[PDB]
Enzyme design. Structure first.
Site, short mmCIF file in Angstrom:
data_model
loop_
_atom_site.label_atom_id
_atom_site.label_comp_id
_atom_site.label_asym_id
_atom_site.label_seq_id
_atom_site.Cartn_x
_atom_site.Cartn_y
_atom_site.Cartn_z
N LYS A 143 8.04 5.16 -2.11
CA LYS A 143 7.82 4.06 -1.20
C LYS A 143 8.60 4.31 0.12
CE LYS A 143 8.00 -0.92 -0.98
NZ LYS A 143 8.48 -2.23 -1.55
N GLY A 180 4.48 -0.50 4.50
CA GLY A 180 4.48 0.94 4.73
C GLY A 180 3.61 1.63 3.71
N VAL A 181 4.04 2.79 3.22
CA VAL A 181 3.18 3.64 2.37
C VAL A 181 3.80 3.90 0.99
CG1 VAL A 181 1.81 5.78 2.27
CG2 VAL A 181 2.32 4.77 4.46
N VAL A 182 2.95 4.06 -0.02
CA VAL A 182 3.34 4.61 -1.30
C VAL A 182 2.60 5.94 -1.57
CG1 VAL A 182 3.75 4.21 -3.77
CG2 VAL A 182 3.87 2.29 -2.16
N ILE A 217 -1.24 6.64 -2.22
CA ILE A 217 -1.83 5.83 -3.28
C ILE A 217 -1.84 4.34 -2.97
CG2 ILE A 217 -1.21 7.65 -4.96
CD1 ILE A 217 1.02 5.88 -6.08
N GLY A 218 -1.21 3.95 -1.87
CA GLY A 218 -1.09 2.55 -1.51
C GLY A 218 -0.65 2.46 -0.07
N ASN A 219 -0.94 1.32 0.58
CA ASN A 219 -0.82 1.24 2.03
C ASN A 219 -0.65 -0.11 2.72
OD1 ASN A 219 -0.78 2.64 4.54
ND2 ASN A 219 -2.25 4.10 3.61
N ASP A 275 8.00 -12.76 -5.38
CA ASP A 275 6.62 -12.31 -5.15
C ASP A 275 5.93 -11.87 -6.45
OD1 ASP A 275 4.36 -11.85 -3.56
OD2 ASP A 275 5.01 -9.78 -3.07
N1 LIG Z 1 1.82 3.69 -9.15
C1 LIG Z 1 3.07 3.22 -8.87
N2 LIG Z 1 4.17 3.64 -9.55
C2 LIG Z 1 5.40 3.19 -9.23
C3 LIG Z 1 5.59 2.26 -8.20
C4 LIG Z 1 4.44 1.86 -7.49
C5 LIG Z 1 4.58 0.85 -6.42
C6 LIG Z 1 5.70 0.33 -5.76
C7 LIG Z 1 5.15 -0.65 -4.94
C8 LIG Z 1 3.69 -0.67 -5.15
N3 LIG Z 1 3.41 0.25 -6.07
C9 LIG Z 1 2.78 -1.61 -4.46
C10 LIG Z 1 2.66 -2.79 -5.45
C11 LIG Z 1 2.25 -4.10 -4.77
F1 LIG Z 1 0.90 -4.10 -4.47
C12 LIG Z 1 3.42 -2.03 -3.12
N4 LIG Z 1 4.88 -2.22 -3.13
C13 LIG Z 1 5.74 -1.59 -3.96
O1 LIG Z 1 6.96 -1.78 -3.96
N5 LIG Z 1 3.20 2.31 -7.86
#
Ligand SMILES: Nc1nccc(-c2cc3c([nH]2)[C@@H](CCF)CNC3=O)n1
Length: 336
Positions: free
Chosen positions: A51, A34-36, A28-30, A141
């Site tokens: 994470k 690293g990765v989420v 869901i994130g990158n 941040d």
């Molecule tokens: N959807 C969702 N739920 C719980 C936690 C997260 C999350 C943790 C982190 C992120 N999303 C992104 C937010 C910054 F762009 C990257 N870093 C995190 O710690 N995202």
């Protein structure tokens, strides 16, 4: 459907690993870190985010150690952590939206977020900061992407403690943390003796952006950012400069003129008190919670637009109030 079973350590209390099963894993994130992933816990059907970060061989992971100490309704919860092949995995509560994504939706509909949500999101952010600051922990941040939202309950949860550090007087810290647009002037000027008030500046920048529909101090360089600041605050005096620590000549743009004309006066007054040159002149987070812009949240009849009650707003602890215990009579209203 593929199940992963790991032996994971609960984020809080006693170091007692338990076997944890999860499924429906997807990215869901990158970014840099690293990765989420998102996943679903087999036992409870609860959704979590994982994470996954590369783990230094030498050191203890600082992000992890800070998250194990934190327990607050406006901060994402560390449920578990574990190691995999070496990577640290943070199992976090899943939160579906972010202030960034919600703001950008209104922005491109040529619309601003209703003030009831500006009030709710900002108050909850200031709470999360009151809490971490009471431990001397600075997030470093603060930005819309790091403010997760549950749109239904209107709960806001601070996340991403990858830059966070306990700030100790007389210790120097790196000036290159914090994201462009949200960086306090002392950071732009390269101070290493900054305090937790850098979070306050960053919070003032999110507030202004929700009110305006766009960032208030944009710029691809320090110089361009500073000019935007000077354009609103006017040129800093020599004492103000020495206070940020480490030369264009503009008079202050009156804060009423900065925003569209139906902007609540207490909203503007709150910005002017967050976005101050001198770091010690900025409101503290607890003082900011108690500002009159947030009075409507303290109204016994306040409701969410979806007809639900407001989320938890008043459950302060002694730890959270410690910077100024007398604010409790403002912060916990008669009916709470
Ligand atoms: N959807 C969702 N739920 C719980 C936690 C997260 C999350 C943790 C982190 C992120 N999303 C992104 C937010 C910054 F762009 C990257 N870093 C995190 O710690 N995202």
């Amino acid at each position: 459907s593929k199940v992963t079973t790991v032996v994971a350590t609960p984020g809080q209390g006693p170091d007692r690993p338990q076997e944890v099963s999860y499924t429906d894993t997807k990215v869901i994130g990158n970014g840099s870190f690293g990765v989420v992933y998102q996943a679903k816990l087999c036992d409870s059907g609860e959704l979590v985010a994982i994470k996954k970060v590369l783990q230094d061989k030498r050191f203890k992971n600082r992000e992890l150690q800070i998250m194990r100490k934190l327990d607050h309704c406006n901060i994402v919860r560390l449920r578990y952590f574990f190691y995999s092949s070496v990577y640290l995995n943070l199992v976090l509560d899943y939160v579906p939206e972010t202030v960034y994504r919600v703001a950008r939706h209104y922005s491109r509909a040529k619309q601003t977020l209703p003030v009831i949500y500006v009030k709710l999101y900002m108050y909850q952010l200031f709470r999360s900061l009151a809490y971490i600051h009471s431990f001397g922990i600075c997030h470093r941040d603060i930005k819309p992407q790091n403010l997760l939202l549950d749109p239904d309950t209107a709960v806001l949860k601070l996340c991403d403690f990858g830059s966070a550090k306990q700030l100790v007087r007389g210790e120097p810290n790196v000036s290159y943390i914090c994201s462009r647009y949200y960086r306090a002037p002392e950071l732009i000027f390269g101070a290493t003796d900054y305090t937790s008030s850098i979070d306050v500046w960053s919070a003032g920048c999110v507030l202004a952006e929700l009110l305006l529909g766009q960032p208030i101090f944009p710029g691809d360089s320090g110089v361009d950012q500073l000019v935007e600041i000077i354009k609103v605050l006017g040129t800093p005096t020599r004492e103000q400069i020495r206070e940020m620590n480490p030369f264009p000549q503009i008079k202050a743009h009156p804060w009423t003129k900065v925003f569209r004309p139906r902007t609540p006066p207490e909203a503007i007054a709150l910005c002017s008190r967050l976005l101050e040159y001198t770091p010690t002149a900025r409101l503290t987070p607890l003082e900011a919670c108690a500002h009159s812009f947030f009075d409507e949240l303290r109204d016994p009849n306040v409701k969410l637009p979806n007809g639900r009650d407001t989320p938890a707003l008043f459950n302060f602890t002694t730890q959270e109030l410690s910077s100024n215990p007398p604010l409790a009579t403002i912060l916990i209203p008669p009916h709470a």
